[PDB]
Amino acid sequence: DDDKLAAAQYPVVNTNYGKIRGLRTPLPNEILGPVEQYLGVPYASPPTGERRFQPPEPPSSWTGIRNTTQFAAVCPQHLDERSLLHDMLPIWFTANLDTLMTYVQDQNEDCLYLNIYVPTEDDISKKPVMVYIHGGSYMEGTGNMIDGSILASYGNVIVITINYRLGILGFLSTGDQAAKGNYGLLDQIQALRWIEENVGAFGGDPKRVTIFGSGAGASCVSLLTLSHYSEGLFQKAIIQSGTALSSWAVNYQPAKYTRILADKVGCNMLDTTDMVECLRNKNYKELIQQTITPATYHIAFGPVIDGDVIPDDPQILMEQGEFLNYDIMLGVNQGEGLKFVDGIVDNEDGVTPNDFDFSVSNFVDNLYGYPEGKDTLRETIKFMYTDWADKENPETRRKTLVALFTDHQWVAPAVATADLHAQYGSPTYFYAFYHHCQSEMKPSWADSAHGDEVPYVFGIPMIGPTELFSCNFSKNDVMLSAVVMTYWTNFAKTGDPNQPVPVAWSRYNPKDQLYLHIGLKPRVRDHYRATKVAFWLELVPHL
Amino acid sequence: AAQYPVVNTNYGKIRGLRTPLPNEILGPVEQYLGVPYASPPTGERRFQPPEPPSSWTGIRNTTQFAAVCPQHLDERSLLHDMLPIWFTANLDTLMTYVQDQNEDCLYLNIYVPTESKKPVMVYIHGGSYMEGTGNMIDGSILASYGNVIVITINYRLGILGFLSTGDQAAKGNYGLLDQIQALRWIEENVGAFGGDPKRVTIFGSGAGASCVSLLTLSHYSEGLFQKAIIQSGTALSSWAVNYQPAKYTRILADKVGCNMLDTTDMVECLRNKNYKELIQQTITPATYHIAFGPVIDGDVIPDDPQILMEQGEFLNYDIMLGVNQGEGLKFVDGIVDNEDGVTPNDFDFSVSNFVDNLYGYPEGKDTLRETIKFMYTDWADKENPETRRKTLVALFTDHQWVAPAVATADLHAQYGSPTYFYAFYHHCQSEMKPSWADSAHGDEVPYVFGIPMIGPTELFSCNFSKNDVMLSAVVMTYWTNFAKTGDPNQPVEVAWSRYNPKDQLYLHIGLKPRVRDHYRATKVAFWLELVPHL
Ligand SMILES: *[C@@H]1O[C@H](CO)[C@@H](O)[C@H](O)[C@H]1NC(C)=O
Ligand SMILES: *[C@@H]1O[C@H](CO)[C@@H](O)[C@H](O)[C@H]1NC(C)=O
Ligand SMILES: *[C@@H]1O[C@H](CO)[C@@H](O)[C@H](O)[C@H]1NC(C)=O
Ligand SMILES: *[C@H]1O[C@H](CO)[C@@H](O)[C@H](O)[C@H]1NC(C)=O
Ligand SMILES: [Cl-]
Ligand SMILES: [Cl-]
Ligand SMILES: [Cl-]
Ligand SMILES: [Cl-]
Ligand SMILES: [Cl-]
Ligand SMILES: [Cl-]
Ligand code: NA
């Protein structure tokens, strides 16, 4: 280096595709060191024209030095704001999205970019790498929305956020060879390949890559641990409030929704090859502006069992042992399913016996459909989710309904995953998350909800302002963020959330079933919601 | 001499005895033993309702127990293995009471304290309708301690009390009608003993509690008592009522040479048999059921007890009822290992058999079996073999005692009739009880009758401490306050709140008595609400 100061302030890295120039970025927090930011790094060719509804290809090489100093365009996205998938998004998701200048007026089908946050800290070795897969129900979001600077600086790990194709463009499938689906997953895989080959140039360790995600990102992470395409690309996974086993994780009726789309957009031809080519040439505004409403608690565009990328049912893939070679941390938040009681809560924060019966009846219609012994099943669910010690209390009735949806959609599938992963000694760690930041939009009576661990994972309380991310942070929030980031980055470094940086988080196994209660008072407990989980995992599959 | 008090009854004068009690600060008691309350149910009056007794001239001695009703003591029986540890598990020391038997057995015993007209507590013994006697309970301590008259009764048992053809040849329920006739006698005569016929409480344990429950639901009981205490039994359990009397009467009649198909001829033939010929026969009912007991006759018991309760027949009475923590102890006989545990195989076997025996085959038997297995598994400690033992005791206790007691209480308290509920959580030290066992079937009886205030007796079967003495005083005060006022808190203690279906307040009775709520509410709702849909 000749101009050593320029080389420090505007660091240049030589990738396999050419040189890029990033930005050394100080962090306002006095005790956090600067990070190098490389924003808008292309990891694949633009999936445009004939590459729409096709797997991603490697990016083009270049000569000279390419600036990677600001966020690239976001993947095209729209979704009906009354959609159940839209209403299940975190309380902070939309407001934070609208903060992004790239989101607001820089959507582009050319969107396969990633963002890299490198600690400037000097190890006097190669740093662990944490790769984040954002949520948003497969339809919305961007890696740009998460600043990985503080996690990187606090943990002395490289943090990478990725953009992958969303919605129709990422997941359209015909259920046959014309459009095999899973484009967004293949994008994630191609990012991980790029990372494997290029992260060494940033001082990163390809042999210590952890993938992590929340919501639909956690479903993606779970699905990647079960695909042969992912092998040798990462060694650890953290799975936050999502799984491969939930009703909205996989689309079992892709052809139906693709046809509904085609007909809304002037592609009424029956031949699937011609229909796909017609959609392939449609202006993308036309496509993403359509409202294709799935059956309740299901998805219209998302991952499919294609027989290749996802060879079979996720339960079967877990039973066959695909994910056993990864160390896995996974968990849930106490009241993920808060939106389940949207509409049915009164001004005294209660629900009526009538509302309860209706809600359970609709739950069974939508999630079980018409199984052997449906009437028995509905009755047994009502019984299990009634508090017989206080059966006239309307506020308790509200709580049990949130519990029903939380248990079924998040808790039982997480525990099933944990049990399938831990059953032969593969390292497994389970958490239940009990804290949430103060937010005026949230009801007083609400527990930790869907997306509420995310501010703690990314160290947002340390950024500076008390009022950010739809939160009002306290000193306890700062402490809890530090606890969480230490566990998460320790895990990335060693596969053990207790090592090397200093309460002991014990390993999960199906026998003792130890889990970390994460809150202001972290503590190891056992058999999380054991009776309700056993209900869903053991009794119900016979009713 | 004052040692031999004479009382004029409506039928003639009787001589009893003034008995000192070992304790000097408990008053003496006058005892009138073997008082006839009905004519002998013999000859043509076998299998007929009881008639009033005959009058007599002069003074008739009522100075010793009369002969008990015929009964066989059989260790092959489950209705025998069911009986309290004190009842029959002590053998040659119970035979003391049951050796002098006679079909002429319609006698009662009266215990009058010597301290206005006194309340009267009338006790109906248990023994599965098949065995026992009032003579086995000495009412002297309860009477003297509570300042109430205590009366124990003998009623026809087994075949002679309960044989029925299921038609008009033998309508059944002779034993219940005996109890009614004793209550009539008491209503008409107890005044001569200083008793108040307007303050009569009936009480019973086990099958005696089932009898009490059934009497609250019979129009024949009207005007004979105002209060009931119902200890560890109901009208609603599988062994309370015989829904198949003709079957078992036919089996008996065939063993004994009464093979006629005409039921009038079969009954008259049975009348001609020696009673010993009858009580000797092994007649084995379906498991958890009875061969000879109360029947739905259309008269004494017009309909299913559930239906009688919903029509409100017992709404006039003030009722105290309860159960013991671990009633169903015998359910796990033979499957508890030397470390007090039960295996998962023995758990699955017990539950499966439980369902075969109590549900037979309802709409969805497999669903039912798997659901019961789920509900009685401790999913937070799935491998613990001692917990597995506890949950089996709980299964049987919940089904046979707790759920039907709560159903009875709810139906009684529904529209504001005074109702009190208890759960009994203490038992005396006994070497033939396992160290891990909770309060079992019959374990409240020594406390109700003040047995710790005398000491270990032959029948009980207990070593007693200071705590047992105090618990007896607590129980006797509640029981006798209730007989006095209808309120266990008032004579003219921890406050025992009324039971209603909303708040569901009950008294935890033990060394630390206290009011709690919603006793085993989840398990009770399982049996009462969900299961009838499975
Ligand atoms: C790269 O960014 C820097 C910083 O603003 C700018 O001076 C330089 O001209 C940029 N290079 C190109 C090719 O845009
Ligand atoms: C009544 O009992 C007394 C006291 O034992 C006795 O003196 C008398 O002979 C008895 N009367 C009879 C048997 O008629
Ligand atoms: C009472 O205690 C004695 C010790 O004096 C013991 O031998 C006996 O077995 C106990 N009795 C019962 C019924 O448990
Ligand atoms: C943050 O708390 C302040 C009071 O300190 C309040 O005015 C504001 O509405 C809160 N913001 C959120 C997003 O909860
Ligand atoms: Cl490119
Ligand atoms: Cl996210
Ligand atoms: Cl639970
Ligand atoms: Cl007579
Ligand atoms: Cl008794
Ligand atoms: Cl319970
Ligand atoms: Na700083």
PDB file of all heavy atoms in Angstrom, chain A residues 310-329:
ATOM      1  N   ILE A 310     -35.154 -29.679  -2.232  1.00  0.00           N
ATOM      2  CA  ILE A 310     -35.836 -30.193  -1.056  1.00  0.00           C
ATOM      3  C   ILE A 310     -36.434 -31.499  -1.503  1.00  0.00           C
ATOM      4  O   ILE A 310     -37.490 -31.488  -2.111  1.00  0.00           O
ATOM      5  CB  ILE A 310     -36.917 -29.229  -0.556  1.00  0.00           C
ATOM      6  CG1 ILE A 310     -36.301 -27.873  -0.285  1.00  0.00           C
ATOM      7  CG2 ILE A 310     -37.598 -29.771   0.716  1.00  0.00           C
ATOM      8  CD1 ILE A 310     -37.321 -26.795   0.118  1.00  0.00           C
ATOM      9  N   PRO A 311     -35.705 -32.625  -1.279  1.00  0.00           N
ATOM     10  CA  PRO A 311     -36.074 -33.906  -1.877  1.00  0.00           C
ATOM     11  C   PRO A 311     -37.351 -34.543  -1.372  1.00  0.00           C
ATOM     12  O   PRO A 311     -37.964 -35.311  -2.092  1.00  0.00           O
ATOM     13  CB  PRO A 311     -34.849 -34.823  -1.601  1.00  0.00           C
ATOM     14  CG  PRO A 311     -33.775 -33.926  -1.155  1.00  0.00           C
ATOM     15  CD  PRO A 311     -34.439 -32.722  -0.544  1.00  0.00           C
ATOM     16  N   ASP A 312     -37.761 -34.210  -0.163  1.00  0.00           N
ATOM     17  CA  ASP A 312     -38.914 -34.849   0.460  1.00  0.00           C
ATOM     18  C   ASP A 312     -39.418 -33.937   1.557  1.00  0.00           C
ATOM     19  O   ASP A 312     -38.862 -32.870   1.829  1.00  0.00           O
ATOM     20  CB  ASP A 312     -38.493 -36.196   1.084  1.00  0.00           C
ATOM     21  CG  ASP A 312     -39.605 -37.232   1.089  1.00  0.00           C
ATOM     22  OD1 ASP A 312     -40.818 -36.898   1.029  1.00  0.00           O
ATOM     23  OD2 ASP A 312     -39.250 -38.414   1.171  1.00  0.00           O
ATOM     24  N   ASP A 313     -40.477 -34.395   2.190  1.00  0.00           N
ATOM     25  CA  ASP A 313     -41.035 -33.767   3.343  1.00  0.00           C
ATOM     26  C   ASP A 313     -39.967 -33.479   4.400  1.00  0.00           C
ATOM     27  O   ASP A 313     -39.224 -34.378   4.763  1.00  0.00           O
ATOM     28  CB  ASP A 313     -42.030 -34.734   3.946  1.00  0.00           C
ATOM     29  CG  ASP A 313     -43.355 -34.152   4.041  1.00  0.00           C
ATOM     30  OD1 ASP A 313     -44.096 -34.247   3.006  1.00  0.00           O
ATOM     31  OD2 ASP A 313     -43.599 -33.544   5.124  1.00  0.00           O
ATOM     32  N   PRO A 314     -39.893 -32.234   4.896  1.00  0.00           N
ATOM     33  CA  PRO A 314     -38.909 -31.895   5.927  1.00  0.00           C
ATOM     34  C   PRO A 314     -38.843 -32.841   7.124  1.00  0.00           C
ATOM     35  O   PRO A 314     -37.747 -33.157   7.553  1.00  0.00           O
ATOM     36  CB  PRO A 314     -39.309 -30.467   6.328  1.00  0.00           C
ATOM     37  CG  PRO A 314     -39.838 -29.915   5.118  1.00  0.00           C
ATOM     38  CD  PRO A 314     -40.644 -31.040   4.496  1.00  0.00           C
ATOM     39  N   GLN A 315     -39.980 -33.302   7.641  1.00  0.00           N
ATOM     40  CA  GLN A 315     -39.963 -34.281   8.731  1.00  0.00           C
ATOM     41  C   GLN A 315     -39.150 -35.524   8.352  1.00  0.00           C
ATOM     42  O   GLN A 315     -38.308 -35.992   9.148  1.00  0.00           O
ATOM     43  CB  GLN A 315     -41.381 -34.695   9.138  1.00  0.00           C
ATOM     44  CG  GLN A 315     -41.426 -35.510  10.432  1.00  0.00           C
ATOM     45  CD  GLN A 315     -42.831 -35.853  10.874  1.00  0.00           C
ATOM     46  OE1 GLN A 315     -43.695 -34.989  10.976  1.00  0.00           O
ATOM     47  NE2 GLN A 315     -43.056 -37.120  11.169  1.00  0.00           N
ATOM     48  N   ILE A 316     -39.406 -36.047   7.153  1.00  0.00           N
ATOM     49  CA  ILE A 316     -38.672 -37.202   6.646  1.00  0.00           C
ATOM     50  C   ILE A 316     -37.193 -36.880   6.521  1.00  0.00           C
ATOM     51  O   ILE A 316     -36.366 -37.677   6.939  1.00  0.00           O
ATOM     52  CB  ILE A 316     -39.241 -37.723   5.302  1.00  0.00           C
ATOM     53  CG1 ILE A 316     -40.630 -38.306   5.531  1.00  0.00           C
ATOM     54  CG2 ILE A 316     -38.344 -38.821   4.709  1.00  0.00           C
ATOM     55  CD1 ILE A 316     -41.420 -38.576   4.197  1.00  0.00           C
ATOM     56  N   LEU A 317     -36.851 -35.703   5.988  1.00  0.00           N
ATOM     57  CA  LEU A 317     -35.435 -35.335   5.822  1.00  0.00           C
ATOM     58  C   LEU A 317     -34.692 -35.273   7.175  1.00  0.00           C
ATOM     59  O   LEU A 317     -33.534 -35.691   7.269  1.00  0.00           O
ATOM     60  CB  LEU A 317     -35.310 -34.002   5.080  1.00  0.00           C
ATOM     61  CG  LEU A 317     -35.896 -33.965   3.659  1.00  0.00           C
ATOM     62  CD1 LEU A 317     -35.756 -32.607   3.100  1.00  0.00           C
ATOM     63  CD2 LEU A 317     -35.219 -34.983   2.758  1.00  0.00           C
ATOM     64  N   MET A 318     -35.380 -34.791   8.212  1.00  0.00           N
ATOM     65  CA  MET A 318     -34.841 -34.757   9.579  1.00  0.00           C
ATOM     66  C   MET A 318     -34.669 -36.146  10.193  1.00  0.00           C
ATOM     67  O   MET A 318     -33.656 -36.416  10.853  1.00  0.00           O
ATOM     68  CB  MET A 318     -35.732 -33.915  10.461  1.00  0.00           C
ATOM     69  CG  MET A 318     -35.637 -32.436  10.161  1.00  0.00           C
ATOM     70  SD  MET A 318     -36.500 -31.380  11.340  1.00  0.00           S
ATOM     71  CE  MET A 318     -38.155 -31.941  11.249  1.00  0.00           C
ATOM     72  N   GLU A 319     -35.649 -37.018   9.964  1.00  0.00           N
ATOM     73  CA  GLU A 319     -35.586 -38.399  10.405  1.00  0.00           C
ATOM     74  C   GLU A 319     -34.467 -39.170   9.713  1.00  0.00           C
ATOM     75  O   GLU A 319     -33.892 -40.078  10.311  1.00  0.00           O
ATOM     76  CB  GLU A 319     -36.931 -39.107  10.174  1.00  0.00           C
ATOM     77  CG  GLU A 319     -38.018 -38.570  11.084  1.00  0.00           C
ATOM     78  CD  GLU A 319     -39.436 -38.965  10.695  1.00  0.00           C
ATOM     79  OE1 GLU A 319     -39.684 -39.454   9.574  1.00  0.00           O
ATOM     80  OE2 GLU A 319     -40.320 -38.758  11.544  1.00  0.00           O
ATOM     81  N   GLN A 320     -34.162 -38.816   8.467  1.00  0.00           N
ATOM     82  CA  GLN A 320     -33.054 -39.445   7.745  1.00  0.00           C
ATOM     83  C   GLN A 320     -31.674 -38.937   8.179  1.00  0.00           C
ATOM     84  O   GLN A 320     -30.673 -39.530   7.824  1.00  0.00           O
ATOM     85  CB  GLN A 320     -33.210 -39.231   6.244  1.00  0.00           C
ATOM     86  CG  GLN A 320     -34.278 -40.102   5.632  1.00  0.00           C
ATOM     87  CD  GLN A 320     -34.594 -39.738   4.176  1.00  0.00           C
ATOM     88  OE1 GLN A 320     -35.445 -40.378   3.553  1.00  0.00           O
ATOM     89  NE2 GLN A 320     -33.929 -38.708   3.639  1.00  0.00           N
ATOM     90  N   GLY A 321     -31.636 -37.813   8.882  1.00  0.00           N
ATOM     91  CA  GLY A 321     -30.432 -37.317   9.508  1.00  0.00           C
ATOM     92  C   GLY A 321     -29.621 -36.279   8.757  1.00  0.00           C
ATOM     93  O   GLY A 321     -28.472 -36.058   9.108  1.00  0.00           O
ATOM     94  N   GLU A 322     -30.208 -35.598   7.769  1.00  0.00           N
ATOM     95  CA  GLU A 322     -29.440 -34.633   6.976  1.00  0.00           C
ATOM     96  C   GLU A 322     -28.787 -33.539   7.834  1.00  0.00           C
ATOM     97  O   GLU A 322     -27.636 -33.156   7.602  1.00  0.00           O
ATOM     98  CB  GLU A 322     -30.311 -33.991   5.882  1.00  0.00           C
ATOM     99  CG  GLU A 322     -29.546 -32.962   4.988  1.00  0.00           C
ATOM    100  CD  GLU A 322     -28.382 -33.577   4.160  1.00  0.00           C
ATOM    101  OE1 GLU A 322     -28.407 -34.803   3.882  1.00  0.00           O
ATOM    102  OE2 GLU A 322     -27.454 -32.822   3.793  1.00  0.00           O
ATOM    103  N   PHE A 323     -29.503 -33.049   8.845  1.00  0.00           N
ATOM    104  CA  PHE A 323     -29.006 -31.903   9.617  1.00  0.00           C
ATOM    105  C   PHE A 323     -28.096 -32.217  10.803  1.00  0.00           C
ATOM    106  O   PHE A 323     -27.661 -31.318  11.505  1.00  0.00           O
ATOM    107  CB  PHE A 323     -30.150 -30.954   9.982  1.00  0.00           C
ATOM    108  CG  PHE A 323     -31.164 -31.485  10.973  1.00  0.00           C
ATOM    109  CD1 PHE A 323     -32.115 -30.600  11.477  1.00  0.00           C
ATOM    110  CD2 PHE A 323     -31.222 -32.828  11.383  1.00  0.00           C
ATOM    111  CE1 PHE A 323     -33.046 -31.021  12.398  1.00  0.00           C
ATOM    112  CE2 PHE A 323     -32.154 -33.244  12.276  1.00  0.00           C
ATOM    113  CZ  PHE A 323     -33.078 -32.346  12.783  1.00  0.00           C
ATOM    114  N   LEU A 324     -27.770 -33.490  10.979  1.00  0.00           N
ATOM    115  CA  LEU A 324     -26.997 -33.943  12.115  1.00  0.00           C
ATOM    116  C   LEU A 324     -25.561 -33.431  12.123  1.00  0.00           C
ATOM    117  O   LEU A 324     -24.928 -33.409  13.183  1.00  0.00           O
ATOM    118  CB  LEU A 324     -26.976 -35.479  12.181  1.00  0.00           C
ATOM    119  CG  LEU A 324     -28.314 -36.170  12.442  1.00  0.00           C
ATOM    120  CD1 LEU A 324     -28.145 -37.690  12.399  1.00  0.00           C
ATOM    121  CD2 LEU A 324     -28.928 -35.694  13.755  1.00  0.00           C
ATOM    122  N   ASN A 325     -25.051 -33.014  10.965  1.00  0.00           N
ATOM    123  CA  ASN A 325     -23.658 -32.551  10.909  1.00  0.00           C
ATOM    124  C   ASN A 325     -23.495 -31.082  11.245  1.00  0.00           C
ATOM    125  O   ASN A 325     -22.384 -30.587  11.246  1.00  0.00           O
ATOM    126  CB  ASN A 325     -22.967 -32.902   9.562  1.00  0.00           C
ATOM    127  CG  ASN A 325     -23.650 -32.276   8.347  1.00  0.00           C
ATOM    128  OD1 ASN A 325     -23.207 -31.242   7.867  1.00  0.00           O
ATOM    129  ND2 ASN A 325     -24.683 -32.923   7.823  1.00  0.00           N
ATOM    130  N   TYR A 326     -24.608 -30.397  11.513  1.00  0.00           N
ATOM    131  CA  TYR A 326     -24.595 -29.006  11.946  1.00  0.00           C
ATOM    132  C   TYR A 326     -24.834 -28.927  13.462  1.00  0.00           C
ATOM    133  O   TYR A 326     -25.631 -29.684  14.020  1.00  0.00           O
ATOM    134  CB  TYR A 326     -25.642 -28.195  11.172  1.00  0.00           C
ATOM    135  CG  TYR A 326     -25.545 -28.395   9.676  1.00  0.00           C
ATOM    136  CD1 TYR A 326     -26.536 -29.061   8.970  1.00  0.00           C
ATOM    137  CD2 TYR A 326     -24.426 -27.957   8.971  1.00  0.00           C
ATOM    138  CE1 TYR A 326     -26.437 -29.257   7.585  1.00  0.00           C
ATOM    139  CE2 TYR A 326     -24.301 -28.174   7.604  1.00  0.00           C
ATOM    140  CZ  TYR A 326     -25.320 -28.827   6.906  1.00  0.00           C
ATOM    141  OH  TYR A 326     -25.202 -29.020   5.537  1.00  0.00           O
ATOM    142  N   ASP A 327     -24.095 -28.058  14.136  1.00  0.00           N
ATOM    143  CA  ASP A 327     -24.439 -27.665  15.500  1.00  0.00           C
ATOM    144  C   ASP A 327     -25.590 -26.660  15.376  1.00  0.00           C
ATOM    145  O   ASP A 327     -25.468 -25.751  14.590  1.00  0.00           O
ATOM    146  CB  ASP A 327     -23.301 -26.916  16.172  1.00  0.00           C
ATOM    147  CG  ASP A 327     -22.137 -27.772  16.494  1.00  0.00           C
ATOM    148  OD1 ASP A 327     -22.176 -29.013  16.296  1.00  0.00           O
ATOM    149  OD2 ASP A 327     -21.166 -27.171  17.006  1.00  0.00           O
ATOM    150  N   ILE A 328     -26.671 -26.828  16.152  1.00  0.00           N
ATOM    151  CA  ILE A 328     -27.852 -25.990  16.031  1.00  0.00           C
ATOM    152  C   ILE A 328     -28.326 -25.364  17.358  1.00  0.00           C
ATOM    153  O   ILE A 328     -28.403 -26.014  18.381  1.00  0.00           O
ATOM    154  CB  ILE A 328     -29.008 -26.727  15.327  1.00  0.00           C
ATOM    155  CG1 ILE A 328     -28.592 -27.077  13.889  1.00  0.00           C
ATOM    156  CG2 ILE A 328     -30.294 -25.867  15.296  1.00  0.00           C
ATOM    157  CD1 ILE A 328     -29.688 -27.720  13.060  1.00  0.00           C
ATOM    158  N   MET A 329     -28.595 -24.064  17.303  1.00  0.00           N
ATOM    159  CA  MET A 329     -29.276 -23.365  18.376  1.00  0.00           C
ATOM    160  C   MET A 329     -30.639 -22.965  17.835  1.00  0.00           C
ATOM    161  O   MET A 329     -30.763 -22.462  16.711  1.00  0.00           O
ATOM    162  CB  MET A 329     -28.459 -22.142  18.807  1.00  0.00           C
ATOM    163  CG  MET A 329     -29.166 -21.172  19.734  1.00  0.00           C
ATOM    164  SD  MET A 329     -28.179 -19.639  19.923  1.00  0.00           S
ATOM    165  CE  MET A 329     -26.692 -20.274  20.693  1.00  0.00           C
TER     166      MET A 329
END
